[PDB]
Amino acid sequence: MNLEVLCGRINVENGLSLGEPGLYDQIYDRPGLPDLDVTVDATGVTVDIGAVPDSASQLGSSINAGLITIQLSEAYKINHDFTFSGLRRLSEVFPITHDGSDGMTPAVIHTRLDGTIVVVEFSTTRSHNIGGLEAAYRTKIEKYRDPISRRVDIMENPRVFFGVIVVSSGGVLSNMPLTQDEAEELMYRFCIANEIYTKARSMDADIELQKSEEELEAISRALSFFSLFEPNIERVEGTFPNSEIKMLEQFLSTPADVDFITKTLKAKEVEAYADLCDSHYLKPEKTIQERLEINRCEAIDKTQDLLAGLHARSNKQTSLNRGTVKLPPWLPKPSSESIDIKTDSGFGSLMDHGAYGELWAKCLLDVSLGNVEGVVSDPAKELDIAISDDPEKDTPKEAKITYRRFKPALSSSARQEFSLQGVEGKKWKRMAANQKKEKESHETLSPFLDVEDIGDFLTFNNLLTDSRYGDESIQRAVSILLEKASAMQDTELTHALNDSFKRNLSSNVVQWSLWVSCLAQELASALKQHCRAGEFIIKKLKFWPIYVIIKPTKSSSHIFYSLGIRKADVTRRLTGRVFSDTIDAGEWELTEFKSLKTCKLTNLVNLPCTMLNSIAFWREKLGVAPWLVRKPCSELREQVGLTFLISLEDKSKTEEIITLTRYTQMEGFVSPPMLPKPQKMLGKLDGPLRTKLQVYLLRKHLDCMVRIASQPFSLIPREGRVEWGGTFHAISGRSTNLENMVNSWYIGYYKNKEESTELNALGEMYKKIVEMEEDKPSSPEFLGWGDTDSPKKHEFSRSFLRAACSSLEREIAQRHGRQWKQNLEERVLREIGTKNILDLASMKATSNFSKDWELYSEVQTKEYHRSKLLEKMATLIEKGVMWYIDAVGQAWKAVLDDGCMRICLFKKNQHREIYVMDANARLVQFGVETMARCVCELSPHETVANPRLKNSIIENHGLKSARSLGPGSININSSNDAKKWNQGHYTTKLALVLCWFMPAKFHRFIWAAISMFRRKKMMVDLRFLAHLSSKSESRSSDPFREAMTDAFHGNRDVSWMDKGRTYIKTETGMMQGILHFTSSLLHSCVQSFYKSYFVSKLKEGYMGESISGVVDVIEGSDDSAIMISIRPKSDMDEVRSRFFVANLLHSVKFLNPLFGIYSSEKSTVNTVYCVEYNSEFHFHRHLVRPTLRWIAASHQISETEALASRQEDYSNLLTQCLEGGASFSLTYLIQCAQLLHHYMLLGLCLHPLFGTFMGMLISDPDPALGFFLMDNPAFAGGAGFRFNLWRACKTTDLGRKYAYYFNEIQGHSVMVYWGDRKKYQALLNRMGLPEDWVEQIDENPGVLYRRAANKKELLLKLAEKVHSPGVTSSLSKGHVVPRVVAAGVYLLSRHCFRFSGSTQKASLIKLLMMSSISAMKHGGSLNPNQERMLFPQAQEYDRVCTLLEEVEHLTGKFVVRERNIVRSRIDLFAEDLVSEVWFGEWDKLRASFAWLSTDPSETLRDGPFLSHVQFRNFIAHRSVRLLGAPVTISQVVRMNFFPGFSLE
RNA sequence: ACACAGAGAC
RNA sequence: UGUGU
Ligand SMILES: [Mg+2]
């Protein structure tokens, strides 16, 4: 075709301006692939292009019909000249300076007239990923940047425009304004070019361009292994369950029974039709209202049935005295900062009022007499410890034991009551009435409980009421910290968004959370302050007059705390009945001995930031601007109260009611002829009720179930869009918009992620593992050997699987062309041969379970601990193997000799069951996974290995429908979920699915690799068996408990366990994530069958016409969607067409078991303009993501050791809130809460010397020492920590510190070592690492830059890997979070930091004053070359900085926002130092560096680089994708600042 | 109190 | 108990 059309309408805009990358992908459908027979020889390629199949789309019209012959020496670029067929001199274009960059010609150089040259360059990418597609375009720009950049400017009136054409089968990228149909024409021609290239390369050699030596050797190793490796198929058939190879030959060779598939599909269609008529009441004829009332009656009946069922199991008690909140409603006025405990008076009257009064009278009396130490705290001596040198002598060791410990010598009755309250409950465990309380504890509550205090508290309370404290010690400190942090950016629109934060910090809820968080931090600090029997710890909160008596429990775990405060010392209280009762003892108000576990304190430490983020978010969602002041509404109070009660309770069951409200409230989008069926959720609401808030949430959940069944959300099409009406809060029941209803479903994510792994909740994991195993079919006849037409559980149909695999093969060959197996083979061999054994060497976990651990008698003495993968990898390297290809054989031999898999188990938790396998089984698993990943990337509609496809497939479906149907097409969708995915797939299925898509070479390896899954030996926890066998009691109420006890003791034998064995056995079912890319391939095959079947059904019509429709599918691993868009010919035809589509989508629920897939009841079927995929809701043109999901995780206690990486993690979590739909103002508020959290973790409420710390930090503001940097509020979150550090370097005295650190030196950062030290030491001696490793780095310094040549530099690569600063934090598990919380009492004063150096240790105050000591020596500022070297995005950093200057005054207008919120990506923002000079043109770049000497070794000290490894670590040193209206950086700040607000 | 249709914990 | 003299 002509070229001026392509180079036409484009404007020039002066010159020296490129075009933004516009990504185009194959939205449209192609007619097909013609015949491309290729004839060898005649020193050239002689192709025979057949006639293109004609289509109504006319896409394939520019193909060359006939024969074209191109000679050799060009077939190495056959793609280049072929896909651009039909589409000079550089000195001809412009005068030449003869600088040497001449003689290279662009593909198209023609000027196109009009005075602008419009030089364009052509490129091709065979790699099927975005990465190579972008890299080719970038490198084309790089290698033709120079002429356009400078050579053009020297001539009169320059006019140029550079273009790059990059084509791939997946998509095409160009800055050129390019026609859509032209884009798919280019991709089509590229597909023919790829087919021709593969046939030419397969026919003969030397067509392919010479590659690197390492890739050829990598292919050679893999080919030799796959040709040579033998698995001894007889032994793997005999040892494991049904694994005969004959299954593979029968599956691959025998065609599917087309008569069976046709008959089975019709029967399942009839069954689905009957079920749809019966469940949705469609026959006989009834109006919509009558069926809606019938659905209402059935939902009400099922609700009352559930209530009556839960009532009978419960104790029939009308009212209970339990309080939802286990903390007092106290709101004491903050006082001067002091942890001192003073006697005062009035403790004499405490004796009479109860046992708690007796304890609180004995406690304060010891303070008066001075027996207890630490009642007075003097920071003057502690300040000396921080600043003194030689700190081993100065620190008092003996002060730890007796710090604030008192013995009350208490009476008997008080001890009895405390034993009733759990304190010292082992001494008087049995006694009297203790067993009565214990048996009363295990009582399920009744659903008809009088839970009306919760409803009154949520609607009416004093939350979000200004406490009128305003200027008090904690808030003064927070305000000072905020005002110091906002200094480099101190302007207006910072004050406006800081005053809102201070107003939100002065509410009753936030002050209450503040002192509760102080209490939680003090209890975390008291965890390791162990006491003897009868010894308690008095403490006092730094800013509040609250005294706490702590009884630490041995081995951490629980903590016992009793609060006390003078009656005159409580200014205000929270107005609610949800709080627990408090003992009134004269002038003192007391509290019972409540209990919190070691992980319950983490939820209370983050309470103030949680409340602040909830207030800011739910003020944003109601439209109230931060700078405005208004009284809270009903919705605001109810949402904050729900968040408050959820965060304080911290129970897993309570979240499950609100978590499951999503699946019962999404059913209101179900269009007719189907009725909403929200009563599917009742199966998951059978859990026992153990708290009044659970009762209230269940009662409010069932009322939401009646409303959804009664009435669905009406479409209400107003103009060019659909806006659903009738949306309402699930628990509150109050009407609201769509986003609030969606966001309310994620309120339950306010619970802490990790709760515990106790031996009571660990039992139900094995219930999940076993109950599916017991459903194994008796005969293996239906396990892949034949067809069933009615599969039971664990069974599938072979013919249906073959039909799905054939459909996926056809759809892959459609886009990828023929000979797709050749490219897949080459990619697999390349990616297997290149990888070395040390690449896999990273510590995640392994399992030491073996044959020696299979008997419980020999293991009772020992304790089970699991090693890391690095130890096994180092053992393998010491054996001699360095390549991954030389491995795998030994691992498979070991697994076959063992005959099973050795797996251990964790519980963990999600907002879960994970499996850790042995090192031998992991390598073979890694191999079978790296096959499946390369296989599934060819799939056109999965998202697990093609992450771009998630937000591509759903929106591009409308673009297909626009041409294939025209305007007015009706879209019907179906959000799908799968039940029992991990437990329900027999492993023969995945083996056949994977072996379908490979050459015959890999079939033996795959069969051997995943034939081992059919016999698993999973190790249970050792402590579980101790308590299972020690009692030896058959008494139980849950049958699984008795079954597991019987299996262990061997009274009756079962298949899933044996007598006296530590492991449990499981044949049926894969595992979570261990088989992730193969099950995704299976589930892609299943819904590639579904799309073709739906297309055929739509083509055949409903009695013989052609119902025009478009079917599109997306399925990553488990979540999946089916989008069908149709157009009705007539208005009467519309109802019949929609009924046909409803029948088509309802048939899926019955067609899934044919492939051995069980459709869950969480799947929402037959919705119009509503589709959901991976928690991302697509409501027509209004994409909705839960912002509440990401702001609740924005403040996480960081286990990192740098203390400068804490702010990096905070920025990383801040960016995730911005991408979730949060505005810039809300993101700035989240950052202020993150600052509050950061300074809480540094000792705001735990260290008396924190005021001196902030005073010294104000003088020297610097990260890596405890200073927080804040983003610009206009662009908060969109800029990373580097931009903030660059702005600080340019705008404050930190530039002096960096200038002396780098510019003026001839010859930084801190580590803190979270976690213990002896286990790291016990790790190193086990390794084979040489003790002299550091000085072997000096000679041959290429070890740190070249990955692997010989074996000698191995274990040195591993040593420099393990000695990375980030590795040390990886040794620490999740148990170091309480240590990070408790460390705030000694970070500033005591010496825990090292200067990144074991000889020297320094405190934070000492390091800060050494920075002050290092002052007055810093000379100059940042050299402009330093600003480019340290910050290689400095130029566009400045460009963003200028673009943020005009947004300085809060001036704007309130305009109604259009609801067309879609995803929008913003494209904003030293290897040559190694590859040249040091190791084997552009040599002036080293001269441009202008430092150091030209010698790899010695070179004295250019900087503080004492070792070459440290230099390598130093030399190792963002396209944030927002969500808003579709329209650019200036406009984003203009638009996405507040919903409905425009910032001028 | 703590988890839990008692197999823990204190 | 890098524990708050
Ligand atoms: Mg889903």
GROMACS .gro file of C-alpha atoms and ligand atoms in nm, chain A residues 662 975-977 1119-1120 1162 1172-1174, ligand 1:
model
   11
  662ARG     CA    1  -1.905  -0.976   4.817
  975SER     CA    2  -1.760  -1.437   3.648
  976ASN     CA    3  -1.642  -1.788   3.729
  977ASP     CA    4  -1.473  -1.943   4.033
 1119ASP     CA    5  -1.045  -1.703   3.842
 1120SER     CA    6  -1.198  -1.696   3.496
 1162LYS     CA    7  -1.877  -1.812   4.435
 1172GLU     CA    8  -1.496  -0.975   3.766
 1173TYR     CA    9  -1.144  -1.114   3.731
 1174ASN     CA   10  -0.875  -1.129   4.004
 1560MG      MG   11  -1.406  -1.465   4.030
   0.00000   0.00000   0.00000
